[PDB]
């Protein structure tokens, strides 16, 4: 998937009055277009976008005492004249205090008039000139924490390679890495976003809109 969590906390939340005015006051807000998830900081419509029509509205949800913890174990073991042991142990814990979720739903005419923007039309022309079929993403909803939340991260990576050569030299490498990070954020930040994929290829009459899940 429903949402894509962002592992970044350097993005302040937009204010409510500027959420739907067409000129956001934050790095990430509803109405932006990004080339890809990785290139999240390259906002195509940096100048702004058309204000939401009266039909458009934002739906809000509230959550309290929300926490999220996950673990991961990866044991890549190769036994043979060599021996490899790659052990990865990862632990992540997030304990929030209050979370708010904003969502919206697009419309065919609104996306069409959005594609007529100067920056958007410049990008699509460049993409069409370079690539046969263009594809972009649009941020639909944002989940914003309130007051931050505690974070605990524990990473353990152990790599052991033992190679036997048969004058019969032997090479033994045994490396270990531990990292325990404790953080206590005390400010609001964007947690997760929803992306809508807009693509067109093969000289289609109209573009195609799809949803992306993890």
């Amino acid at each position: 998937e429903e949402w894509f969590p962002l592992k970044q906390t350097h993005y302040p939340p937009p204010t409510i009055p500027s959420m739907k005015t067409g000129h956001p006051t934050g790095p990430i807000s509803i109405g932006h277009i990004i080339p890809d998830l990785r290139h999240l900081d390259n906002v195509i419509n940096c100048k702004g976008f058309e204000p939401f029509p009266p039909n458009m509205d934002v739906f809000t949800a509230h959550y309290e005492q929300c926490h999220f913890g996950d673990h991961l174990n990866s044991e890549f073991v190769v036994q043979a004249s060599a021996g490899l042991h790659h052990t990865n142990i990862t632990s992540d814990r997030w304990e929030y205090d209050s979370v708010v979720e904003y969502a919206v739903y697009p419309t065919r005419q609104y996306i069409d008039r959005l594609l007529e923007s100067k920056e958007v039309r410049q990008y699509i022309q460049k993409s069409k000139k370079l690539l046969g079929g263009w594809c972009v993403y649009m941020v639909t909803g944002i989940m914003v924490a309130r007051g931050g939340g505690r974070n605990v991260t524990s990473e353990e990576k152990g790599a052991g390679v033992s190679g036997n050569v048969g004058f019969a030299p032997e090479v033994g490498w045994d490396t270990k890495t531990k990292t325990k990070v404790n953080a206590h954020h005390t400010t609001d930040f964007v947690c997760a976003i929803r992306l809508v994929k807009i693509a067109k290829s093969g000289l289609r009459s109209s573009w195609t809109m799809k949803k992306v899940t993890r």
Binding site: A61, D70, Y105
Partner: protein, 234 residues
């Protein structure tokens, strides 16, 4: 089947008011009188903000209230397989997935209406519906329309506490030389939703093979016709 209530995956829809639902105001996408191609496409409302007025014979019945609704569901399964081909090579693959859900709610409120033949016929004669069925371009569905109409809504009043746990264990071993790898993941998500919002909806399937046959309607029981449709909770 016996249970015919399908729960929604989105909780940001505001709850409709009694006067608004009587007047047929589509404040939220999930409301009585709407037509959707499928449950997963609730946002794709066929009606263009034109709700047929409710006649004097149409009633919303009463607000059936449910208190202290706590249900627990643990769905766990484990599959394994072994493929050994001669030289001798053996492969062992195990996949275990466990999903444990735990929900608690304090107050749920039910609203339900009974569609009639005349009302559905009036709705199906709208220009928007005629345009939508005209969008169909195929030979197998020669006039075959499969639309779902929202017939009942149950609204949670006070939020609730949700707990979800997902365990995934993938063990892949190959014996030739030999390599084995275990990937164990355990995700947790605890939440305390607060606020009034629609909780689940009941839909009645309307189908019509062609103009020669008569269009039929029936309440959906069990699971929806969509792919991997979620079964009714209660």
């Amino acid at each position: 089947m016996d249970k015919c209530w399908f729960t929604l995956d989105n909780a940001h829809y505001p709850p409709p008011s009694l006067d608004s639902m009587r007047s047929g105001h589509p404040i939220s996408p999930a409301s009585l009188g709407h037509l959707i191609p499928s449950l997963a496409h609730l946002d794709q409302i066929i009606n263009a903000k034109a709700i047929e007025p409710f006649p004097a014979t149409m009633d919303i019945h009463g607000p059936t209230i449910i208190e202290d609704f706590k249900w627990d569901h643990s769905h766990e399964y484990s599959l394994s397989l072994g493929g050994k081909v001669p030289l001798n090579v053996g492969l062992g693959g195990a996949f275990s997935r466990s999903v444990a859900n735990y929900w608690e709610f304090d107050r749920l409120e039910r609203y339900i209406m009974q569609p009639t033949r005349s009302y559905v016929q009036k709705c199906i004669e709208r220009d928007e519906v005629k345009r939508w069925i005209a969008k169909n371009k195929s030979m197998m569905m020669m006039g075959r329309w499969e639309v779902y109409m929202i017939t009942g809504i149950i609204v949670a009043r006070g939020g609730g506490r949700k707990k979800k746990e997902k365990t995934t264990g993938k063990e892949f071993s190959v014996e030739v030389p030999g390599g084995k790898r275990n990937t164990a993941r355990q995700k947790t998500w605890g939440t305390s939703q607060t606020g009034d919002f629609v909780w689940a909806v009941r839909l009645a399937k309307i189908t019509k093979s062609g103009l020669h046959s008569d269009w039929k309607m029936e309440t959906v029981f069990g699971k929806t016709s969509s792919f991997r449709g979620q079964k009714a909770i209660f």
